[PDB]
Amino acid sequence: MLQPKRTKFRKMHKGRNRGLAQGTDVSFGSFGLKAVGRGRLTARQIEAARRAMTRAVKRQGKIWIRVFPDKPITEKPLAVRMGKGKGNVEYWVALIQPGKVLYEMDGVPEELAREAFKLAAAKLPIKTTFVTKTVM
Amino acid sequence: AKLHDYYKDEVVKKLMTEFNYNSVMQVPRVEKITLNMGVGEAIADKKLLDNAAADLAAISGQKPLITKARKSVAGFKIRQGYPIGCKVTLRGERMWEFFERLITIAVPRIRDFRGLSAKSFDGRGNYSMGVREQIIFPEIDYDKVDRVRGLDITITTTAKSDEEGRALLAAFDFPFR
Amino acid sequence: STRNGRDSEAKRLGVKRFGGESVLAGSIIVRQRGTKFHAGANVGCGRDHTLFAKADGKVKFEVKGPKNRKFISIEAE
Amino acid sequence: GIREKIKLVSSAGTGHFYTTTKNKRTKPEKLELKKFDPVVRQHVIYKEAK
Amino acid sequence: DKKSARIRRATRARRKLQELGATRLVVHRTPRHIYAQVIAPNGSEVLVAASTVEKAIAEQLKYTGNKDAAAAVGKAVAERALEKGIKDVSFDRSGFQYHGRVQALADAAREAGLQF
Amino acid sequence: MKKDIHPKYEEITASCSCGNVMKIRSTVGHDLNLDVCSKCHPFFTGKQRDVATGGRVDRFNKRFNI
RNA sequence: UGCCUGGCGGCCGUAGCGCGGUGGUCCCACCUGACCCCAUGCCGAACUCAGAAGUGAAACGCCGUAGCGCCGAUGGUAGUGUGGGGUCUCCCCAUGCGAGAGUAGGGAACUGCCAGGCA
RNA sequence: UCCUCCUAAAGAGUAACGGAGGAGCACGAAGGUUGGCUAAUCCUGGUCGGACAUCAGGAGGUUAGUGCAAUGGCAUAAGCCAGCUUGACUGCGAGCGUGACGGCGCGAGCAGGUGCGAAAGCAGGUCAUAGUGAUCCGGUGGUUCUGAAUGGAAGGGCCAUC
RNA sequence: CCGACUUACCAACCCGAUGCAAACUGCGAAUACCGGAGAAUGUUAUCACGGGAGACACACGGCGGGUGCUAACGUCCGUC
Numbered sequence: 014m015l016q017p018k019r020t021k022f023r024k025m026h027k028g029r030n031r032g033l034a035q036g037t038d039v040s041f042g043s044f045g046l047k048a049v050g051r052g053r054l055t056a057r058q059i060e061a062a063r064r065a066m067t068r069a070v071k072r073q074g075k076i077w078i079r080v081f082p083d084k085p086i087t088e089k090p091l092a093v094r095m096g097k098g099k100g101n102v103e104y105w106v107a108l109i110q111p112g113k114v115l116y117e118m119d120g121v122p123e124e125l126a127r128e129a130f131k132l133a134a135a136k137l138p139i140k141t142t143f144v145t146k147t148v149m
Numbered sequence: 150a151k152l153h154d155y156y157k158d159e160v161v162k163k164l165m166t167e168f169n170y171n172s173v174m175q176v177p178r179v180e181k182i183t184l185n186m187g188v189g190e191a192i193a194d195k196k197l198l199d200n201a202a203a204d205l206a207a208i209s210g211q212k213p214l215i216t217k218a219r220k221s222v223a224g225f226k227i228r229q230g231y232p233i234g235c236k237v238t239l240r241g242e243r244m245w246e247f248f249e250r251l252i253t254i255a256v257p258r259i260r261d262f263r264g265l266s267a268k269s270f271d272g273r274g275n276y277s278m279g280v281r282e283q284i285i286f287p288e289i290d291y292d293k294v295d296r297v298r299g300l301d302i303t304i305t306t307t308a309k310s311d312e313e314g315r316a317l318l319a320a321f322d323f324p325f326r
Numbered sequence: 327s328t329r330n331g332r333d334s335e336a337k338r339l340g341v342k343r344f345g346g347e348s349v350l351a352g353s354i355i356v357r358q359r360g361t362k363f364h365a366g367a368n369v370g371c372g373r374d375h376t377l378f379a380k381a382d383g384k385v386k387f388e389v390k391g392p393k394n395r396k397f398i399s400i401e402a403e
Numbered sequence: 404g405i406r407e408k409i410k411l412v413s414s415a416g417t418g419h420f421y422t423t424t425k426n427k428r429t430k431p432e433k434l435e436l437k438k439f440d441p442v443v444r445q446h447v448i449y450k451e452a453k
Numbered sequence: 454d455k456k457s458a459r460i461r462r463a464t465r466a467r468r469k470l471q472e473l474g475a476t477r478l479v480v481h482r483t484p485r486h487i488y489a490q491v492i493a494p495n496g497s498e499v500l501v502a503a504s505t506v507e508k509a510i511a512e513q514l515k516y517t518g519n520k521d522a523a524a525a526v527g528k529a530v531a532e533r534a535l536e537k538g539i540k541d542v543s544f545d546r547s548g549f550q551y552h553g554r555v556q557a558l559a560d561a562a563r564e565a566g567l568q569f
Numbered sequence: 570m571k572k573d574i575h576p577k578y579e580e581i582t583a584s585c586s587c588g589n590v591m592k593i594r595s596t597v598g599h600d601l602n603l604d605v606c607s608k609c610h611p612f613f614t615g616k617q618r619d620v621a622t623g624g625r626v627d628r629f630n631k632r633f634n635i
Numbered sequence: 636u637g638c639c640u641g642g643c644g645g646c647c648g649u650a651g652c653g654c655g656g657u658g659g660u661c662c663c664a665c666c667u668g669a670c671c672c673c674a675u676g677c678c679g680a681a682c683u684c685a686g687a688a689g690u691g692a693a694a695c696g697c698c699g700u701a702g703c704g705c706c707g708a709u710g711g712u713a714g715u716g717u718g719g720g721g722u723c724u725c726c727c728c729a730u731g732c733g734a735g736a737g738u739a740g741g742g743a744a745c746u747g748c749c750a751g752g753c754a
Numbered sequence: 755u756c757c758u759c760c761u762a763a764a765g766a767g768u769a770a771c772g773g774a775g776g777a778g779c780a781c782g783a784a785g786g787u788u789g790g791c792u793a794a795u796c797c798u799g800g801u802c803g804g805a806c807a808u809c810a811g812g813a814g815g816u817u818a819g820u821g822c823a824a825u826g827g828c829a830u831a832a833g834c835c836a837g838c839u840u841g842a843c844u845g846c847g848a849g850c851g852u853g854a855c856g857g858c859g860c861g862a863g864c865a866g867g868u869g870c871g872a873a874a875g876c877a878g879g880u881c882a883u884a885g886u887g888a889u890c891c892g893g894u895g896g897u898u899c900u901g902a903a904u905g906g907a908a909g910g911g912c913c914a915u916c
Numbered sequence: 917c918c919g920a921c922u923u924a925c926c927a928a929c930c931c932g933a934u935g936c937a938a939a940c941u942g943c944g945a946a947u948a949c950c951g952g953a954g955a956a957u958g959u960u961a962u963c964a965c966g967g968g969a970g971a972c973a974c975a976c977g978g979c980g981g982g983u984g985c986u987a988a989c990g991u992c993c994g995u996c
C-alpha cells in the first residue's frame with residue numbers, strides 16, 4: 014500500500030481539485046491507462062488495480078505507477094459530535110484530474126496490454142482510457 | 150641557511166634544464182613548513198598539551214599555536230573551543246634551518262630507517278610525513294620527555310604538480326625509494 | 327484534537343506611503359521585520375528596521391545594488 | 404527570575420540613583436559605572452547600593 | 454586575492470561617505486608609488502589629482518614610494534585644491550591601515566591648509 | 570619574532586664520530602655529538618646486509634658432517 | 636585624435652565560470668631585506684617599513700572559443716474582472732487583461748571623469 | 755495574557771473546541787566604538803587516529819552562524835576575534851504608525867555632559883518581533899510646594915523607586 | 917592476522933527522465949488598494965464639531981475557503 018513515510022505535517026487541508034493534469038503522455042513504457050474523469054483515488058484502489066494487472070500478464074514486462082497518494086484524509090469517528098479538533102488520518106488519496114496517466118507498462122503485445130488495462134480500469138472509480146506512446 | 154643558496158645556485162639550474170622552463174622563477178620553490186601534533190587525549194587533562202607545546206618549541210624555535218576544535222563531534226566527546234593540538238609554521242630562514250637538520254640528523258636517527266615513501270604527495274605537489282617519534286631530533290634528551298607523541302611534517306611547495314614536487318624534493322637529497 | 331488554538335495580534339506591517347506620495351519629515355514609509363526595503367537617499371532606519379523619511383518629498387522605490395535589493399529614497403520635489 | 408534589582412547611588416553626594424538588574428550568583432561584587440548626575444550636571448561614579 | 458579582500462575591507466567607510474554626501478580624498482598606495490585625488494560628492498568625476506607618477510613631483514624626490522614621498526604628494530593635493538575653493542573634505546583610507554605613508558600623506562595635506 | 574616569548578635560538582657545532590662537522594643553528598645550549606649522519610648512514614649499501622634474517626637448510630647442512 | 640595602463644563611479648551575469656593565446660619602455664604584479672615605523676593569540680605568510688636585482692611563472696588586463704551560467708520572443712495553454720448559461724463537489728459563452736514552463740533565437744558587455752607611457 | 759507561521763482570497767484587518775510551535779527570561783558583556791576576519795560539507799596526502807578531532811592543498815559557496823520558537827533579515831556583515839570604554843545618560847522633541855479608550859511603537863533634530871576614532875562620524879541598550887499586569891493602599895530617599903492663630907512639626911503634594 | 921577470493925543482497929551522494937505541497941519559491945497574473953492629473957455627472961453625496969437614538973440573537977443565494985463525508989434548510993470567516 015503506497016503511503017509517504019516521514020511527512021512534514023500529520024493533517025492537511027481539504028483543498029479543491031481543478032484544472033487538467035501534467036503527466037499526460039507515456040514517458041517510460043509504451044501503453045498507458047489515462048484518466049478521463051476527476052476525483053481522489055485512494056491508495057487501496059491503486060494496489061487493487063495493480064494486482065489485477067501483474068496477474069493478467071503475470072510474467073512479462075515492467076509496470077510503472079505514475080501516481081502516489083501523498084494526501085492524508087481524516088475521518089471523524091462514529092457517535093462523535095462536530096468540533097473539538099480535526100479527525101484522525103485514516104487513508105491516503107492521490108488527487109486525479111483528467112489527462113493524468115495512472116499506470117503504464119512495456120514488454121507485452123498490445124492486445125494483451127489492452128485487455129490487462131481493462132481488468133484494472135474496473136477497480137478505479139474514475140473513468141479511464143487506453144493511450145499509446147507518441148513521437149512529439 | 151646553506152640550503153637556501155644551495156637551492157639558488159644548484160637546484161634552480163638542475164630543474165631548469167630537466168623540465169625545460171622558459172622563465173627563471175617558474176621553477177617550484179618551498180614556501181613554508183607546517184609542524185603539528187594533535188594530542189587528542191588532552192580532553193581529559195590539560196598538562197599534556199602544555200607538554201607537547203614544550204616539545205614543538207624545542208624542535209623548532211617558535212612558540213606553538215594551540216588549535217581548538219572546529220566543531221563539536223560526539224564521536225570523541227569534544228566541543229567547540231576545546232584545545233586539541235598545537236601547530237607551528239616555519240618560513241624563510243628558520244624554515245631552512247629546521248629543514249637542513251631534518252634531512253641530515255633527524256631522519257638518519259629513525260629507528261630501523263627504511264626510506265620515506267615518495268607517493269605521499271597530495272596531488273598538487275605538497276609533501277606530508279609522519280614521524281611517530283619525537284626523540285629522533287637531538288633537542289630531546291630522552292629523560293625530560295615522557296610520551297612518544299609524534300609530529301606531522303608538511304612540505305608546502307609552490308609546485309603545480311606532484312611530478313614537479315617529487316623532482317624538487319629529490320634535488321635536495323630527500324631519502325625516497 | 328485540541329492542544330492548539332493560539333495566535334498573536336497582527337502587527338499591521340507593510341508599506342504605508344507608496345511610491346509617488348508626498349510625505350513630510352519623519353513620516354513612516356514602511357514597517358518591516360527584516361530589511362526587505364533598504365534605506366536609500368534621505369530616508370533613515372529605526373532599531374526595528376522601520377524606514378522613515380528624513381526630508382519632505384516624494385517617495386521613490388528603486389532596485390539599485392549588486393544583489394538587486396529594493397531601495398527607498400526621497401526626492402525633495 | 405534569578406536576576407534581582409539593585410540601585411547605583413551616586414558618589415557626588417546628592418541623592419540620585421539609576422536602578423538596574425544584576426545577577427548575584429555569578430558575580431557577588433559591586434558595580435562601578437561612570438554615569439550622568441542631573442543634580443550636579445556632571446559625569447560621576449555610581450557605586451552599587453541597596 | 455590580496456586586493457579584493459582589501460576592497461571589501463574599505464566598502465563600509467566608502468559607502469557611508471557617499472550617503473553622507475561629502476567630498477572625499479581617496480588614497481591609493483603601491484609598493485612603488487602613491488596616488489591621491491579629490492573626488493566630488495557625486496563620486497563619478499574628480500576635481501584635483503596629484504601623484505608620484507606626475508613628473509612635476511617625482512624629479513625632486515629621491516625614490517617615489519616612501520614616507521618622504523607621501524609627504525610631498527599630500528602637500529601637492531592640498532595646495533592644488535586650495536585655489537579651487539575646496540577646503541572641507543573627508544579622508545578615505547581605501548582599506549590601507551592609517552599607519553604609514555597614508556598617514557604622512559594625510560598629515561602633510563592636513564598641515565597644508567586642508568581641513569579634515 | 571615577538572620579542573622574548575620564544576626559546577633561545579643560537580648556533581651550535583654538531584659533529585659526527587666520522588667527521589661530518591656541520592655548523593647548525595638549534596636550541597640545545599651545548600654542542601652535540603651523534604652517530605653517522607645522512608652522508609654515512611648505511612641506508613643505501615646495507616640493503617642486502619639488512620635482509621638476511623633466517624637460514625636453516627645450510628645451517629643443518631653444516632651439521633651434516635657425515 | 637589613436638593605442639596600452641592605474642584610480643573613482645554608472646550599470647548591474649546578453650555583464651559570470653570554463654578552455655586557449657598574449658602583455659612588461661611606463662603602469663601593475665610577484666620580489667630582495669628587516670635592527671627601525673608597525674605585526675603575528677606561532678610565522679614580515681597577512682599588515683608595515685626600506686629599495687630595486689630578477690621575472691611576466693602565479694595574479695591582473697586584453698583577445699579568441701559557446702562547454703555551462705545568463706537573456707529570450709511569435710503562436711498556443713492555464714488563470715481571471717464584468718455580464719449570461721449548463722447535465723452547476725466542475726465547467727461553457729461574449730468581452731477585457733493574459734502568464735509560468737518550453738521552442739526559434741540572442742549571447743562571451745557598454746559607458747562617464749581624471750592621471751601616466753608611446754606613436 | 756503575550757510571541758511566530760498557515761487558514762487570510764498578492765495593501766491593513768479577518769473566525770472556529772481549525773493545523774503547527776514557543777514566553778513569564780538572559781547579559782556589566784552577550785552593550786558602544788575602532789581595527790581585523792569569513793562558514794557547512796566534501797575530496798586527496800598525513801603517527802597514535804578510527805565513518806568523524808588537529809594539519810596541508812583543491813571543489814564549493816553561505817546549503818553555515820545568530821543566547822532561546824518561527825518568520826523576515828544579515829557579506830558594508832546583524833556571524834567571528836581583539837584594544838579602549840559605560841550613550842544600558844539627563845531635559846526635550848518636528849512628524850508619523852497602531853488602538854473604541856487606557857495605552858503601545860518609530861523618530862531626525864535642539865541643550866548640557868561623556869566614550870571610541872587620526873578624522874568624516876557612530877553611540878538615548880542587545881539582528882527585529884515574546885520575556886508582562888491598571889487604580890486604590892502602603893514602604894524608602896530627595897525636595898520649604900503646602901503646613902487649619904503664629905514659629906515649628908505631624909500629615910499631604912512633586913520627583914525617583916519598592 | 918593481512919581480509920586473501922565470493923553475493924541470489926540492500927544501498928546514501930551525483931547524472932537523465934516523471935509527478936505532489938496551506939505552513940516550498942531560482943517565476944508570477946486578473947482584480948483590489950494607495951497617491952497624482954484631467955473632463956463630464958451627482959438637490960455636499962466628503963470631513964469636523966455638537967443634541968437624540970436604536971443595535972451588538974441574523975437568515976438564505978453567488979464567488980474564495982476552514983470544519984464536516986467538497987453530507988445537512990449544518991457550522992465559522994471574507995465580499996457582494
Ligand SMILES: [Mg+2]
Pocket residue numbers: none
Ligand atoms: Mg493580507
Ligand SMILES: [Mg+2]
Pocket residue numbers: none
Ligand atoms: Mg486581499
Ligand SMILES: [Mg+2]
Pocket residue numbers: 768
Ligand atoms: Mg469583520
Ligand SMILES: [Mg+2]
Pocket residue numbers: 784880
Ligand atoms: Mg549580540
Ligand SMILES: [Mg+2]
Pocket residue numbers: none
Ligand atoms: Mg567593524
Ligand SMILES: [Mg+2]
Pocket residue numbers: none
Ligand atoms: Mg554587535
Ligand SMILES: [Mg+2]
Pocket residue numbers: none
Ligand atoms: Mg534576538
Ligand SMILES: [Mg+2]
Pocket residue numbers: none
Ligand atoms: Mg500652624
Ligand SMILES: [Mg+2]
Pocket residue numbers: none
Ligand atoms: Mg513627604
Ligand SMILES: [Mg+2]
Pocket residue numbers: 972
Ligand atoms: Mg452581546
Ligand SMILES: [Mg+2]
Pocket residue numbers: none
Ligand atoms: Mg453576535
Ligand SMILES: [Mg+2]
Pocket residue numbers: none
Ligand atoms: Mg454571520
Ligand SMILES: [Mg+2]
Pocket residue numbers: none
Ligand atoms: Mg445556517
